[PDB]
Amino acid sequence: AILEADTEFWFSVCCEFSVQHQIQSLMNILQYLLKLPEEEMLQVFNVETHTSKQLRHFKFLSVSFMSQLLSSNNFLKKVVESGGPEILKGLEERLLETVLGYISAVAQSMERNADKLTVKFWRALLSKAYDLLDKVNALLPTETFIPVIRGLVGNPLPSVRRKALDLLNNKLQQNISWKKTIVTRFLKLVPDLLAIVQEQAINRQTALYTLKLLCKNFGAENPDPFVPVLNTAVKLIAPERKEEKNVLGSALLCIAEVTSTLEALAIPQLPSLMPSLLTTMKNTSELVSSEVYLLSALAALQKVVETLPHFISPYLEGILSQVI
Amino acid sequence: SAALLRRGLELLAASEQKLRNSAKGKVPKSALDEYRKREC
């Protein structure tokens, strides 16, 4: 019960001040936890006198307090009285960067296992770091989420961009309808995603997955912005340049989805798209690696033929051979 | 990276205590509106 009273006292102490200084202090303690010895620097916590278990419990209590403060009634009252989310300008994006950097660092340290019993504490620390991540996003409106998610895509670190794309996919998969201005805000992310896919292969494949999700969610109502994407996809499927098989299959699935949404708009690209696709399948037919490559290629043919039946005539003989 | 293809195949298929270890999952509900709904 000492935790509850002490955390309430600390909540009052923190919420006496305004929101900017609170979040700045959160980032500063995130940095301080990042620079701990784990067994110059401003020595605020005495490692020399305290035991390693005490430092472990110190980190655990710090992150738990972080999450509890972001969930506390007092902090939310202070935010609402201060005016609302608009007070948080610029702070939110740096906060996301700091949280993602710290969680990636603690995950990497957890990968450097020393076995014994530290593994359980490291897993719990990752769990509350993800709790911190989930509570940071809950204070962020969907309108402000898009510029900051773009900025996180612009981050140099490769794991931060992956986390950003994961959060974007999560928000895109929630099967809830959207206001018109919000849809227009989603539309603006397309050129940046096209820049990302065009770096680690997982990042490009995740960008293709985001493009496919966008095309599913809004492609029927606003098809025109998806016209350039198909073009890039064709440049990916062309056999002149080599591509990873995993991203090649995702490019094929994006081709199928976009051609489904762009039924007639895909006509000018068909002379360039169709000869390449056939060749790819032949190679994929030669390979016995996995079912997914062949199934993705067959999905490409199925959607191309079903959505656009009447224009594969000059290539018709060819596909019959690929049928056999 | 064969796993992400499978979801993409599932994505087309539509077209016709737990310690967390990933950032991909459920969508957190907005806390300010949960605050304003009850106490205010």
Side-chain angles (χ1 to χ4, degrees):
Chain A
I2 312 177
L3 294 174
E4 321 182 15
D6 280 1
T7 50
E8 284 281 31
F9 171 59
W10 300 335
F11 285 173
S12 77
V13 166
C14 295
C15 296
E16 269 287 337
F17 302 153
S18 61
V19 63
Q20 302 85 357
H21 325 312
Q22 286 169 281
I23 277 165
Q24 175 67 79
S25 309
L26 300 197
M27 294 182 286
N28 295 329
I29 77 178
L30 282 173
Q31 295 297 311
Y32 190 73
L33 292 196
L34 184 62
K35 314 157 64 153
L36 284 178
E38 194 264 335
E39 289 90 8
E40 293 179 353
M41 183 177 176
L42 182 64
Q43 172 197 46
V44 183
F45 181 93
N46 272 318
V47 192
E48 55 187 0
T49 65
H50 300 63
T51 60
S52 311
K53 192 262 183 181
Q54 285 185 318
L55 187 144
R56 183 177 295 114
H57 187 251
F58 173 55
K59 282 144 153 181
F60 207 55
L61 177 74
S62 301
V63 189
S64 66
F65 177 77
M66 293 179 184
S67 52
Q68 289 178 359
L69 185 144
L70 286 180
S71 70
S72 70
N73 295 115
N74 296 115
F75 176 86
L76 271 69
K77 183 177 69 66
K78 186 71 176 177
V79 159
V80 171
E81 285 173 344
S82 64
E86 77 272 17
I87 191 166
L88 294 175
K89 299 289 94 176
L91 275 297
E92 70 276 12
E93 195 273 331
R94 308 198 320 267
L95 174 63
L96 283 170
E97 292 176 331
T98 304
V99 168
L100 290 173
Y102 168 76
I103 191 167
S104 65
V106 63
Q108 191 270 331
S109 71
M110 183 278 288
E111 293 179 353
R112 284 194 262 110
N113 272 330
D115 289 345
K116 181 67 174 66
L117 280 177
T118 61
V119 290
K120 185 183 287 185
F121 149 72
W122 284 116
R123 211 166 296 109
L125 203 57
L126 270 295
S127 77
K128 292 182 181 180
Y130 282 101
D131 287 327
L132 192 45
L133 181 65
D134 302 344
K135 292 165 156 34
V136 161
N137 192 346
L139 293 172
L140 194 65
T142 184
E143 306 146 10
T144 59
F145 181 93
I146 296 194
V148 300
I149 194 66
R150 192 187 306 272
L152 286 152
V153 166
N155 203 45
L157 272 296
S159 298
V160 180
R161 183 166 32 256
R162 265 209 288 280
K163 299 290 185 181
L165 292 165
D166 286 1
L167 289 168
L168 180 59
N169 273 340
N170 292 306
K171 282 192 66 63
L172 274 173
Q173 287 169 225
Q174 70 173 354
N175 69 62
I176 293 318
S177 279
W178 297 96
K179 273 166 295 175
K180 179 67 182 295
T181 176
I182 301 299
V183 176
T184 65
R185 298 295 297 272
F186 282 105
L187 281 181
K188 189 179 289 295
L189 293 174
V190 174
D192 286 330
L193 282 170
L194 288 170
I196 301 299
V197 55
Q198 281 191 135
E199 195 179 5
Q200 312 204 282
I202 298 177
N203 267 308
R204 318 177 60 217
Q205 188 175 6
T206 308
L208 279 163
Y209 195 33
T210 60
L211 291 173
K212 274 178 282 224
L213 280 183
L214 285 167
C215 191
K216 174 175 281 292
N217 286 120
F218 323 115
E221 56 185 0
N222 63 7
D224 210 320
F226 289 103
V227 172
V229 176
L230 191 153
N231 292 100
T232 53
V234 166
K235 290 186 283 187
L236 268 294
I237 193 66
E240 290 85 3
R241 62 174 66 91
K242 316 310 181 205
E243 297 295 329
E244 185 73 25
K245 305 295 290 181
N246 296 316
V247 304
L248 186 68
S250 294
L252 270 182
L253 303 178
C254 183
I255 281 178
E257 178 70 60
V258 174
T259 52
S260 301
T261 56
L262 294 174
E263 64 276 17
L265 273 296
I267 291 287
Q269 197 73 76
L270 194 59
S272 71
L273 187 153
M274 187 66 204
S276 60
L277 178 43
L278 291 179
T279 300
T280 300
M281 294 183 286
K282 185 172 177 64
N283 298 297
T284 301
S285 70
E286 299 166 335
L287 295 173
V288 73
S289 68
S290 65
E291 189 76 25
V292 288
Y293 296 161
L294 210 64
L295 197 155
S296 70
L298 266 62
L301 286 180
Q302 184 73 82
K303 305 304 287 182
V304 160
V305 165
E306 283 182 347
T307 58
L308 209 52
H310 289 312
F311 308 83
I312 310 97
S313 305
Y315 310 97
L316 185 53
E317 173 275 341
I319 63 170
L320 266 70
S321 302
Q322 291 292 333
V323 166
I324 305 301
Chain B
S1 302
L4 277 78
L5 289 172
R6 191 165 295 106
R7 283 95 175 98
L9 292 176
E10 289 173 359
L11 196 63
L12 286 181
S15 84
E16 294 84 4
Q17 43 83 34
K18 186 60 70 177
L19 300 178
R20 298 179 186 84
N21 51 3
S22 69
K24 55 174 73 64
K26 186 180 289 293
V27 175
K29 312 298 216 153
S30 87
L32 276 186
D33 279 325
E34 294 293 328
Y35 173 79
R36 190 173 297 109
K37 179 177 74 69
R38 60 182 187 276
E39 293 179 353
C40 300

